[PDB]
Structure formats: structure tokens, C-alpha cells
Chain length 320, copies 6
């Protein structure tokens, strides 16, 4: 039973904010400064996730959490620690912006893992208790690594985002495959930022968000876009549809955003003017989707929509 709030009567938006936002407060843990990425999945009787909790030293750490309803979370006070047989890769430097999905027989976690700069760390868990670290998927610099929730043509597949070692002023989404969760390849460009005159919310850089959602018309990708104002970056988010069999081929891509920083909890915080989607839960029977997003890099919010309405919107307003 995924979380849901009906669209307010007369609301014409494709996505609408939970009235309970923020659903995770910045100070939920004794040492937490902010909690703003929630890589959430169903698990047994309820829900589990991997959360970015930055502490009062401003260090970036991952913590495991569980919930009955996916709204109110019990997050472990102590950061998640990985088992790894390779001491070189198993060394912890930092970790942020997790994504989690089940593939075939286990849950896989990706995150932005420090290894001589940002790259994509990979691990798996069967139980959300023990996490086994695998090879970093790519050479630095790379972030926004997001796996597909099944193999594509017999290979594991991941979206990523080549970066630099700062506040990156550019960013294309890429796609890569692996036969074995160790060696990666067949890299393909998915999409670049839009032109400023066409769609400025996504004209500086873009990055994948929640795990792709399979639909009959393609993979639904929810992704962030940045606009560079005189005063900083603004992070909004929107939607595209990727080919099912060859997901680096984009079928439709929204001109308008789905959500942008409007509420005080989105506009004021450690990083003002940020809505950064990190996970989603959905139900194909009803078309409901619940999107988790970080707010001002301070707290976590939830927003709701219908998959068919999102698909319609994405087609109707497509810039390709």
C-alpha cells in the first residue's frame, strides 16, 4: 500500500505536494544537520531505504531506515557501513545521493562515493542489514548513477552523469551496461541540457532521479534540471520517456517542469531553491506514483501524481 493523497479539487497540476511536507525533518537523528535524499523501496511488511543524512560536521553519510507507511521513518542513528573484500575500494571517504532498487534477486544500492573524487559506488543487500560493496562502476568524475530495475537484454544497465570535482557547471545524462555488475561499457549519450530559450529550468545541467519506471510506452525518467541565475542554481524536476529496449533513445521530453522550488522548505535552507528527486514508489493498478525529493538540501518532501497523466503531459509538451 503506497502513500497517497488525492489531488485537491480544482488543482490542475500534474504533480502535487504532500500536505505533510516535509515528511522527514532535518533533526531526526541526534547528530543530523539535514536529511534530504531518501532512496526508498518496498520491503517485507513495509518499506526500507537508504538515506543521505549529513551530520553536524557537514560530513555526508548514508543511513538505513524502515517505515510501515513510507511517510514516517525510523532511521538508524549510526551510518551504514559496507562489507568489502577489497581494502582499496572498501575505504570510506564520503557518500551521498543514494538510489535503491531490486534487481532479480537482491537490492542494489548506488551512491556518489568518494574514490579520488566523486564516482558511482555500488553494493547489494538481501536484508537491509548487511551491505556488500562491489566495484565502483566508473572512473571519477561521475554522479547521479541510477540503475534500471531489471536487466535490459540480459545486461544490468545504469544511467549516470559525467561531472567534475566541484559544483559542476555542466551535465549530460549517459547510459551504460554490464554483464556482471563489475565491468561496464557500451556507453551511450541519453540527453544534454536544453537550450536556454527552449526550456531554461534544464539548461545548465541535468541528472537522473528516481529509478526508471517501466510503462508500456517506455521508461518513465524523472530527472532534475538546473537553471543558473545571477544568484545561484535553481533545481527543478521534470519527465522524459525512454525507449524500452534501447533506453538511451529518448522518445519524449517535457518542456515544462513538474515541480520547482516554491514553498519555504524548498526555498530556504542549507542550499536555497532545490527540489531534487531521489526515489519513487508506484502502483501500476491505480497509476499512482509517489515521488520523494530533497528540499533545499535540508529536509525530505513527497509529491504525488498519476503515471498516465505524467506520460500524457510529457508527450503533449515534448521538446523533441
Amino acid at each position: 500500500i503506497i502513500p497517497w493523497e488525492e489531488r485537491p479539487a480544482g488543482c490542475k497540476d500534474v504533480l502535487w505536494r504532500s500536505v505533510a511536507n516535509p515528511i522527514i525533518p532535518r533533526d531526526l537523528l541526534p547528530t543530523s544537520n539535514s536529511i534530504f535524499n531518501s532512496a526508498v523501496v518496498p520491503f517485507g511488511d513495509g518499506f526500507a531505504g537508504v538515506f543521505r543524512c549529513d551530520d553536524t560536521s557537514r560530513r555526508m553519510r548514508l543511513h538505513v531506515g524502515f517505515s510501515k507507511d513510507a511517510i514516517n521513518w525510523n532511521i538508524k542513528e549510526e551510518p551504514l557501513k559496507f562489507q568489502c573484500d577489497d581494502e582499496e575500494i572498501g575505504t570510506w571517504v564520503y557518500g551521498y545521493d543514494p538510489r535503491v532498487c531490486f534487481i532479480e534477486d537482491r537490492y542494489y544500492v548506488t551512491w556518489c562515493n568518494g574514490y579520488h573524487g566523486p564516482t558511482i559506488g555500488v553494493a547489494y543487500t538481501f536484508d537491509f542489514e548487511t551491505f556488500h560493496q562491489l566495484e565502483n562502476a566508473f572512473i571519477p568524475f561521475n554522479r547521479n548513477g541510477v540503475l534500471f530495475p531489471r536487466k535490459i537484454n540480459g545486461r544490468f544497465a545504469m544511467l549516470s552523469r559525467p561531472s567534475d570535482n566541484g559544483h559542476t557547471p555542466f551535465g549530460d545524462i549517459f547510459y551504460s551496461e554490464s554483464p556482471d555488475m563489475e565491468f561496464w561499457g557500451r556507453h551511450r549519450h541519453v540527453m544534454s541540457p536544453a537550450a536556454f530559450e527552449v526550456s531554461a529550468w534544464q539548461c545548465t545541467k541535468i541528472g537522473a532521479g528516481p529509478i526508471p519506471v517501466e510503462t508500456p510506452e517506455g521508461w518513465l525518467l524523472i530527472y532534475h534540471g538546473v537553471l543558473h541565475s545571477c544568484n545561484g542554481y535553481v533545481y527543478s524536476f521534470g519527465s522524459a520517456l525512454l525507449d524500452l529496449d534501447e533506453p538511451w533513445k529518448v522518445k519524449f521530453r517535457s518542456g515544462p517542469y513538474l515541480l520547482a522550488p516554491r514553498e519555504p522548505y524548498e526555498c530556504m535552507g542549507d542550499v536555497p531553491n532545490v527540489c531534487f528527486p531521489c526515489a519513487a514508489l508506484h502502483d501500476n493498478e491505480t497509476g499512482r506514483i509517489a515521488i520523494y525529493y530533497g528540499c533545499a538540501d535540508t529536509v525530505t518532501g513527497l509529491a504525488f501524481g498519476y503515471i498516465p497523466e505524467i506520460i500524457e503531459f510529457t508527450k503533449r509538451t515534448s521538446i523533441i
Copy 2:
């Protein structure tokens, strides 16, 4: 013409005071509007008309016509304004922002920051606020903050402008130019530069003209924006200068203090934090009342009020020239 007005709050010593109804135009007035700021407002018939910068949910910059009985509650058209032009090259729309509007002699003219291989000053006219006829871009890129004078100056059209770059420009002097014909422009003269940081830091990074200049016996009243560069970005405040009537590039007085700076939450939080950007004014010479429209955090529009004579005293008393 009955201009909008609120009396000075009891106890208030400031030369300008914000409307208690601010913001007077909300960000979601149109089905697809993301933000509405810059309101290029004038008296028109029974009421008021305007050209409004309404950025959409694709963050495209578009201009929309609006009308109002009271100049506070606006009815803005959902569909963007399109310009008529016989020249296909100049009539191609790329983007447009920060409109200014005034009547000159027989018609209303609109200038805006128009994209033509980068920012320049677009120019158009209308007789009825329904059909708009586009003329030559007045300048080569990069330029913006183009603001016309509301009558000819010794037989020529005149415009303030602001040479720029193709980014978030880290400089800006105000310039003055003339045209005999609304087509060719020239006799360019420097008006003013940003002040020294130690003299008046609200206006030390760059400056730009705001509302249409207001003719007084003491000179043209210029309301203009200024930028201060903090560690965390630009703060846009606005203040006042007085220009010579006959040669308006000659500045007579220029305020040290600002008239208004970002203070309220609707000025401080939004798409671009800490912006008060004046874009138009209505005034009544009989009473000296002036009402100044300004963009707030690049998100909504506000109003502020004051008296022309008090603004002139303030500009002279506090003048940094």
C-alpha cells in the same frame, strides 16, 4: 486618471513606502505562469494597461498584455503577445523580458530586452494595446534596460540604455541615445557609472534605468536599480537621480542612500533572492503622488508609494554629486 495610492503609514519617516497589499500580482496568475514581475504600466482609456513579463513553467521569458481598472488588480492575457513585423529577420522571436512602456506624441511605444543573437533593445508601438508593430532593434547587442523618454527632446526620440554582456553582467553604466526617426540611433552619451563601494555600495557593481523618466521642473526624475555584489550573490536595490531637462546625460543630483531595498519575504525569497527591480511608475502632477511598480525576487510584483517633491528633496539633500 486616478492613480493607486496609500497614505504614508503613521510614524513612517521613509520617502517611499510599500503597499500593504503587496504582492499586488501573484506568480500563478496565468495557468502556465511561473513568475510575473516587470509590469510596464500606463493609464489607458478608463483604466490602465500594461505589458508584463510572465515567465512560464518552461522558464521561457514572454510578454503578455494586461488591463486593470484600478492599476492593482490585473487581468493579464493568457496568450503571449506577438509582434507584427514585415522584416522576417528582426521579427523572429527568441525571447523577451523587462518591458517598458510610454506614450510619445501619438502612440504608445514598448521597449524590451529582445533576443537577437543575444540581448538587445527591441522596439515596438501600439495604438490600442491589441496590435503591436515591431520596429528595428535600437542597438547592437549586448544591451538592456532600454527606457524611452516620454516626449521628444529637442525634436528627437531619446532612450536610456545599458551596455551589457551575454551573461549575468558584472558591470553596467547607463547611456543616453537619440533618434530622429525611431530607426537610426546615435549621439550616444554616458549618463552615469556605478558608485564607488565606499561611497554608495547598493549601486557599486552595476546600475540600470527603471521606470520611464518623470518630468519635473527640477529635471527628469530617474528611478534606477543598483547592484551590490555580496559573497552570496547580487542584491538589487533602487534609488533616484535628477537629470538635466535638455541634456539628460548630465546628472544634477544622485542619491547616496537607496529608496528601497529587499526587506520583505516576498523580496528576499523566490526565484532570485534579494531583488527589488523597478519597472514602471504612475504619477499625478497635481498632487505629487507617485506609485512605483517593482519586481520582487523575480517572482511577483509589488507597489511602493511616495511624493515627487519629497523624493526630489531627498535626492538633493543626500546627493553624491
Copy 3:
């Protein structure tokens, strides 16, 4: 009789904000734009101070103020003007971020003084009415000059912070001595910004805050640290303990911050996301300390704690 508020019920924090914050509003003077540094000392039957009040021309001026209770302030409308025989040094360009303390027989004030760029101005007063300017202690560019409240083995001592002529993107704390409050030397590096992976609130630059506080164990130094986000700088503050006799030798240095921008008065204003400590009052009998800090470069706030608690926190969370 230093101002005090007891720790809120259940509050686990080493420092807590006054419920009366902001304690000095931005519009206390007829042409003040902001009042956000308050260099406060006990004086006479009450308290005195030098205040940074930027005016509605956005000029940086210092003003004298007085208070019965250290919370409600009566600040002079006219800016403070220094007496100086030397015309060259006595020329006023600008002044900000004052610090004040009693040394031996008079009150000394330091400030960021414009002399072909930022340096550290120095003056004394016996009475908080007339101030007598001395030589600028250093060549530009320097700021965050903070004197020790006694001589250190027979020399005056000062912390400072080499800078540049902009929004400086670096900054180490230094220590210097003078026999005479005119000639300075024996410069020693105190500390550098921490590594991003270790303590990111203090990884861009750091600088001294309140006057150092003598404890049996060393000098308690309360200092600011900067984190560089994509949308600007975030100023937080924390604690270190310096050796009593050779104060450039750091004994402990906190990993977490004591305070970081959280409240709307800290997160919205002329410079968002700033907590900048500028003075403290303390009582060795009770262990109480009250810390004055600028908020968003707009208003002034107060936070409270206990010196022995701050000390034990600094030890236990030390990154050295």
C-alpha cells in the same frame, strides 16, 4: 550580571539560541540598514560596545552603544570618529567587524579598516566616548583581528586572518605579538581550514570570532567557518582550545559546529545563511557564556552555553 537563559527542556545542544533573537534589529538607527556585529564588554554599571551598523547607502560604519542588561541597546546615531595625530593613518575609508577587550589599563578596539584595502585598525578608549587610533597592525590584506585580553608573556597578542581584496576564497588563522601596540611580529600559523571530508562547515576558510576566553586548560577560541555550496557561502561557528602559553599551538578543535544557520533571521537577509560570532560575555564562577553573533548580516543574536561543556565537547569531538 551577564545575560542568561537556561537550556531548553530536553535540549541536547552545547549551545542554544536566545528565545528573544534577534536582540538588535536592523532599524534601530534612523538610517541603519543592518546591525550585525556587536563588540560588547562589561563597562561601569552595565555594558558598552562598538557596533557595525551599515547605513542605507550600504556604507560600513562603527557606532558606540551602551546597555543596562546587554540585550537592549542604546546605540549612538552618529558614527564613531577616531582621533589620530597622523593624517595618513587617520583617514577614514570604511570600517567593519569590530572586536573590543580590556587590556591592563584601557579598552582596545580592532576592526577591519580600509587602508588601500582591508587591514586591521587599532585604537583605544578609556571611557567609550573618545577613541584614539594607533597604527594599523598589519599590511593589507587582513581581517578578523582579535586581541588577547592580557599580555602573553609580556607582549600584546593578536589573532588575524590573511585575506585578499574580495570575497576571499581562503583563510588561515594566524597569531602575532607586539611589545608596544605599534610594531608586530613573531607571526605563527594557528590553523587552516579543515578537509572537506573531515569537517565541511569549516573547509573553505576560517576566522577568529569573540575575544579568546582564558580557561585553566587553555584559551577557548570561538571562530567561524565557511562551507562553499553551489549557491554561496554558509557561515557556521565552532570551538577550539589553544595552548595558554603559546596560543598558536592548538590542543583540540571541534569536528561539529556549535551553531549554524537554521532560523529565518539567520537564513534570510542581506547575506543569507550566516552566523558570525563577534563577541562574548562570560562568568568563570558559573561557567556561563553568552555569544553575540551576526545573523544573515542583518541583525544580531545571542546564544548561551557552559564553558566546561564547550570544552568537553571540543575535546571529545576533536579532529586533532
Copy 4:
């Protein structure tokens, strides 16, 4: 009777350097530091010009010169002064970038003239003794202003180059007209720098060089282009053909350069790696053209070719 050297034996290039380069040395005047722009035209029985001569103070001044053979120049030691009835426009700050041509009944001079930054100064002369200064044609910031040598459908016409107030890191060529040499307008974009992968000698910025040369199929434009290497800008030059009636319409534009810094006098000097064409003499009856170019912002060189060969090259190698 224009300066000429025959194509060297076995040279396959469309332009070839004079074997006597540089033809104007840096120290022709008693305080000249460099002489590297030579606006040159025929005049009387010989030749005249306006020369950029930077002095030993590194000031940028314009000097008149005269020559019998267009090779050996007698340059006036006193800088050129302009007559102007408007004292505002007539104030001299600096001047560089001259270009000179005859239009209908007199010579016109454009230069980069300081008026609150770079813009295009305009003046006329009948005799190279008195120059009457006209209004600056544009608002700053603009450089590389180059007049057409006749009216275009009854209007004066000028190419220009919007700039900034530094070492400008971009630059498109524009076209503008005037009915009266006072008011300017009908601004049209001519061309942008090419993409790096198409033609990198002209991918950073471009600007007009010598006065446009009329051919039966349009205007031959010789223009500089910049490549941004890790160690600086490299200035090369090449050729384009513009529509005769609407010269903003580009018909052909060379992929390859005509000339790039190769010789030591091009590679070493005040600004290394610079070939900047500033003027040309030509003879339609023979097809001969002699192109004057600055070398390393130090000295002046000459290069020779045939207009029909340049035209053929520009079409055959065109990137449009």
C-alpha cells in the same frame, strides 16, 4: 602601382609572406614600442595611412604616415589629433584598431576609441592633415569597425564586433547602416565563430580586418579568428564572401586559414602568436592583392595573393 612579390617558386599557398617582413619595424619613431596596425590607402601619387604606434609608456596612439611605395613609411612623430566641435566626443582617451577607406568624395577613418570603454570612433579627411571627428557610431563595447568602400543602396555601411571591456572571450561580426554618418541602425548579424570541430582557428571569436573588397559575386572579407589554446589566444586570418546587396548574408566562409603565426616575427613579441590583418591594397585589372597584417602586436608584415585564387579557395573550402 601596388607592392608586389611574385609567388615563390613551388609555393602552393594562396597567400605568401613578403620575404622582407617585417616591412615596418617596432622602433621607427623615437618612442615607439610597436607599430602593428597600418591602415593604408592610395593617396595622390603614393600612399597614406593611419598607424597604431604604441609608445614606451604602452599608450595606444594613432599617427599619420605617407609612403611612395607602400613599403617604406614616413610616419609622423606627433600623434594625430582630431578636430571636433563637440568637446565630450572630442576628448581623447586612447585609440587603436584604425581602418581607412575612401567613400565617394573623401577618406574615412574608424578606430577603437575610448569613450567610457571601447567603441568605434569615426572621422573624415580629404588630405591626411586635418581630420574631422564625427559621432562615435555605437555605444560601447565594440571594436573591429570596418566601413564599406561605397554606399550600399544609398547608405553608409559598417561591420563591427560587439565586445566587452577586457580580453573579450567571444565575438560575432555585425553589420549596420547609416544615412548620414551620424545615426546608425538596421543592425544585422553577419557571422559567429565556427564550432571547434569544424574550424578551430576561428572558434573563439572573429572580427573584420581590411576594408571589404568588391568582386562581381560579392564582398571579399578578410577577417581574423581566434583559437584558445591552453597557453593563450592564437590569431589567424581567413576569407569569406558576402552578398553584394545585403552583406550580412554570408555566401562562402573558408575552413582553412589563409595565414597563421609561423615566423619568429609572428610568434615572438609583445603578444605571441598573432597575425592581425588591418588593410589591403588591390588591383582589379591584375587580381593582385597586398595584405597588411600586425605581427605579434610588435611589427607590421605584408602578404600577397590573387583575388580570384582567394575567391576560388574560399568557395572550394567553404564551411557553409
Copy 5:
């Protein structure tokens, strides 16, 4: 038989330049602007290579050459074209930075290949006539890709250099493996730039040069390093020894450079002050090594030394 010149009388240097430098001129081809990378190997009874020949449009293209003595080169006029099964990867944008070696049964080529930015293209050939292009090894941004000349414990191995999309101001060498020349992984950091105060010729960025040369004391890596002066980058090159079995482990790393820009052909040209090594030929029986390097990004030079002397220099001067 590899090229050789004996060390000059009384030369104490570990490497010495050929008296015939530069061995390949900039204008060898009818449209060549510069020829400054030479990826050369033995082939049949003489030698072959892939050369970076930038043309007069300043486009970056690869051309095959052949030589009987590795000194006098006959380079094909037409750019090399790669055959590719996949149209998307097979699309040519640009290419530079070639390296060539034989591995097991064929020659492999790597190069800096444009695919939405710089990455490492891979191809093979049996005959230096037909080249078959494989998957790009990595996601952008990357270059200085250099294969090992045999498999390492049964996998192909490659050094690389994460980059950005400009004149990258950083750069560490990385190591990666592949079972199949398609999927890559087990990425390991090799080395970072040295500290400025330790070895400034390699303090900005580093990158691999010639193919690693197997010695009993490790893999001999010859690599470039950059020093950032006020006036640009200076490229020198030096040596390291890598563990034979785990070549990301660096055993010794030289303090001094082996070669730095000294000669006019290294210090003047399209990019001044560059010695950029691209290939080596060696003979284990005599210990002779001949290293090919680009000079000023304009021409190609050769330098000689003895492998045992280079090993001894590397260890004697090690900064590891």
C-alpha cells in the same frame, strides 16, 4: 633495429635529443598545420604509426604512416577512417592523442575520441590499412588512454586520465581492466600530481605517454606533467616504475624531469613550451630506448637513453 644516437661526449643527462630534431616537420602533408603525436611501433620489416596531423582548418585528424628506419616517415595524405559495426559509435567528430601497441595477435589503437566530449576510443588493425573501431572504453571526460602491451593476469589493461571539457586544470592517472575489450572496470587510482614544493614540473596535472615498457624492476611509465606559470602551462616529462602484477601500485616516481622544453622547436610554435611524449621503441638486449615526443604542438622530436639508466634515475630520485 631501432633508431639510435650515442650520448654526446661528456653529457651527463639521462636522455638526450636527436641532433636531427625535429624529425617530422609541420608541413609534411599538403594540408598539415602540425604533426606532433607519433604513435609508432615495429611493423613487418620496418615501422608503422598513427600520427596526429592537425590541418589548416585546425581540425584534429589521425593519419597512418610507414618508415623503414623510424626517422624518415611517409605519412598518408588522407585521414585514417575507422570501420565500425555501430553507427552511433562509428560517427567521427575529432581525434587526437593516439597510442599504439601490439597485444597478442593484433595492433590496438587508442585515441582521444569525441563522443559528447573527449573519451578514449579503441580500435584494432592487422595491417595499418583497415581499422576496426570498438566501443569507447570510458564515459567522457577522459584522455591519455594508454594500453599495456600484454594482458595482466588475463585481462586487458589501460591507463587513463579523467578530464573535463576544456584545458583541464587537474589530472590523475588511473588504471582499468577489461576481460574483452568491450566492458571495463576494476578502476584504480595510480598517481596524482605532485606537491608544488616537491616536484613542480608535475604539480598541476599528469598523463601517461608511451606504452608502458616491461622491465624486471616494474613497468617503466614515461608520463607528462604540467607546471602552471603566470603565462601558461609548461609540459615536461619524466618516469615512474609500476608494480608488474598490480600496475596501479607505484613503486618509484622521479623528482626531476627527464626532458623539458629548451630548444626553439619546443619553446616556439602553436603551443609554446611543450614536450609531450607519445611513443617509444626499445631493445631489451642493449637497453636502448628511443622516445618520440611532440614539440610545441607543432613538430615531432626524438630523444634517446638507456632503460637501466632510467630505472636507476627513477629510483635514485624517487619522491615515493
Copy 6:
């Protein structure tokens, strides 16, 4: 006897280059990459100096040298080490840009010394064998420290140049005093870069060069100036006259004295640099010989007459 060459026939320049330039080659030492600062003084029956010799690791080191004629130098292969009882200040990180002068009873050496960034290191020697390091005079970031060759109203005095921790894009010359070679103060601004439209060779940044040369008409200061072209910095040098008694007061060049022209000034590790580092002079003949680094690679000499340089500085003054 200071090194000297007569002004070439017909040469109208105030300074003229030695026909023997460069006088010190880049590879004088077994491991030298470049030798381009020569902080030279008369000593004994000859001359002595402290040389910036950057090595083949591109480390910046100081070496002592000696010469009979001040042209052909014998430089010690081993870098100079400084004696210091304070191990914190005595820690060597790097050192460049030395200047050397005699003050009253001994020789002093200043250099740009690494101490958490560039600052001005200070040391003395009685014999050019053992050097004793004193406190760094200033907090970082500071470079171009140049002592006066006598006390000024009973205090040591030094010119300096506030900088940053990179290739500094600005730079004013400052003046400071010390009663004791340990504690410094009375800091005064001497001059700023000129306006681009007035004198562009010195419009980005300036720094003091050789030790100030006393004359009856003021301290003759030879200093570098930078012009920022699209391709980098061009270092030229010129002259100013400072008040004798209060040397932060500038009394009087618009034109440069020397600017990069020769291949050895234009090509090398840092192209387009003439960086003056020391001068020898004889008041009785008016001769001065100025040592300058060329392209941060080698060392050159140029000659002039002090009266002519005074006359040039005054008649072309921009103040």
C-alpha cells in the same frame, strides 16, 4: 670596479643591455633548470651573491655565489641552508626572489619564503658562508621584500608587496619599518599600478626590484611593472624617486627603462619577462649596472648612468 660597457654608438636609450647577455646561463649547475635572480653585492676583493637557482625538479632554491668581476659567477652546487634556533621558522618549504644589501654591520638577505604561503624571509651573514635566519617580517601573502641599504631615522626599513597565493593579479608597493629586525610596523602605501591609459606597462601590478639607490634627489627605486595581455603578463621595469626621509612619499617614470625584446627575454620558462633583482653602482662615476632575470630562465645585465636615470624619471614623471 663595477661591471661596465659603454653606451653603443648612436644609442639614445637611458639603459642599454650588455653585449654578453645572458651573463649567467640556465645550466650552470649540474641540476639547474634556470638561474634568473642574482642578488649581488660587493664583497671582499670581489663580489658575492644569493642566486635563485630552480632545479630540474622545478624546486625553488637559493645558492651562494662568488665572482671577481661580477659577470662570471662561481655558484655553489649545494643550496644554501639557514641556521635558525626556532625550528618552526627554520623549516624550509621553498624560497625565491632574493635581495641582498649591507646594513651597518652585516649583510641581510630577504627572500620570498614559504611559511603557509609566500612571505618575506629575513636572514643575515657576516661572511657569505653561514646565514642566520630571523623572523619572517610579515604574515603571508607578501613578496618583493627589499630592504633599504641604511637605517631611515634610526629604523630598518623595507619595501614589500602584498600578494595572494597564486599568480597575483594585483600589487601595490608598501613600506614598513622595524626598530630591531623582528617587529615591523608603521606600514605605508608607496604606490599603486598606474592607469592603463597613462602607463600600461605598470598597470596590472608593480613590485620593488633592486635595493634602493641613494641619490641627492631621493631614493632611486628600480621596479617591475606588469601589463596583462590576452596571452599573459609582460614584465617591464622602470624608475621612481622616493623622498629621502619619508620614502613612502613618491616624488617622481611614464615610459619603461627596459622591456622584453631579445630572444633570451621573450622565450624560455616564462616568456616576456625582464625582472630586475640587483644593481651595483659607483657614485663617483655615476655608473650603475642592473641585473635582471630574463624569461625566468637566465640572468642579464644592463647599464646606465645614475644622473641620466634621475633626469629621465623627473622629465617623464606621471606625477
